[PDB]
Design an enzyme around this catalytic site. Structure first.
Site, PDB file in Angstrom:
ATOM      1  N   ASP A 195       0.868  -1.195   0.000  1.00  0.00           N
ATOM      2  CA  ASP A 195       0.000   0.000   0.000  1.00  0.00           C
ATOM      3  C   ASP A 195       0.895   1.231   0.000  1.00  0.00           C
ATOM      4  O   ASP A 195       1.867   1.227   0.807  1.00  0.00           O
ATOM      5  CB  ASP A 195      -0.865  -0.025   1.248  1.00  0.00           C
TER       6      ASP A 195
ATOM      7  N   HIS B 221     -10.756  -5.215  -1.628  1.00  0.00           N
ATOM      8  CA  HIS B 221      -9.337  -5.309  -1.188  1.00  0.00           C
ATOM      9  C   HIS B 221      -9.234  -5.709   0.286  1.00  0.00           C
ATOM     10  O   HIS B 221     -10.035  -5.211   1.156  1.00  0.00           O
ATOM     11  CB  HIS B 221      -8.532  -4.058  -1.590  1.00  0.00           C
TER      12      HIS B 221
HETATM   13  C1  LIG Z   1      -3.903   3.852  -0.429  1.00  0.00           C
HETATM   14 AS1  LIG Z   1      -5.456   2.970   0.408  1.00  0.00          AS
HETATM   15  C2  LIG Z   1      -6.115   1.733  -0.984  1.00  0.00           C
HETATM   16  O1  LIG Z   1      -4.858   2.203   1.888  1.00  0.00           O
HETATM   17  O2  LIG Z   1      -6.805   4.034   0.903  1.00  0.00           O
END
Ligand SMILES: C[As](C)(=O)[O-]
Lengths: 116, 116
Positions: B33, B102
């Site tokens: 991330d 995700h």
């Molecule tokens: C950069 As994110 C997918 O942790 O909000």
């Protein structure tokens, strides 16, 4: 090796102690958390004793995904239209707390970032 | 429609954008991330575009478990032997930032309660 394992979660599965049960099938059990961190906070646990996500086997894949499907269905049943957060904790850093796999679902308020 | 979908995560899945890839198979991708909230902070996304956990079909149960199995093996290959926290964000109240399902895995520090 009783069915549902030797944690306080085993006692909930074998109906040895009462709980706020929202959903039951032959694979899992969902119930309200005793210390709710959100207007809606519930747990989804497998009836099979898996002590930690770290030691789930490749063929537990189906069971783990079922926990999530049941979490999302129970979230809709309870009226969580604005959204929710799902959480699985491993070990000390995770705050796992109990040696039996569980999925937290929390909503009914804005959840913040980072997630603790 | 294109392979992997019309989000930023689609671009990652088609190697159009850079990510440091931890793990890849025919069903999913794990990568770091770029707004990390912990010394280790990575995502496991399905190559199939589900917009959100709330619109996941019961046909998606195996794939959802797959994300958590690859999630816990990556945590181990990255050395999170003191534990970790797995998160799925749904919608506005859950802080969902991308409309493609995700799994967050966070470790290398003590995560706190409540989880946001
Ligand atoms: C950069 As994110 C997918 O942790 O909000």
């Amino acid at each position: 090796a009783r069915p549902g394992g030797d944690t306080i979660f085993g006692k909930i599965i074998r109906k040895e102690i009462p709980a706020k049960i929202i959903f039951e099938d032959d694979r899992c059990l969902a119930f309200h958390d005793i210390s709710p961190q959100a207007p809606t906070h519930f747990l989804v646990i497998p009836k099979k004793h898996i002590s930690a996500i770290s030691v789930a086997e490749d063929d537990d894949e189906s069971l783990l995904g079922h926990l999530m499907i049941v979490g999302k269905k129970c979230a809709a049943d309870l009226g969580l239209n604005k959204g929710y957060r799902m959480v699985v904790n491993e070990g000390s850093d995770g705050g796992q707390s109990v040696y039996h796999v569980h999925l937290h679902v929390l909503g009914g308020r804005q959840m913040h970032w980072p997630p603790g």
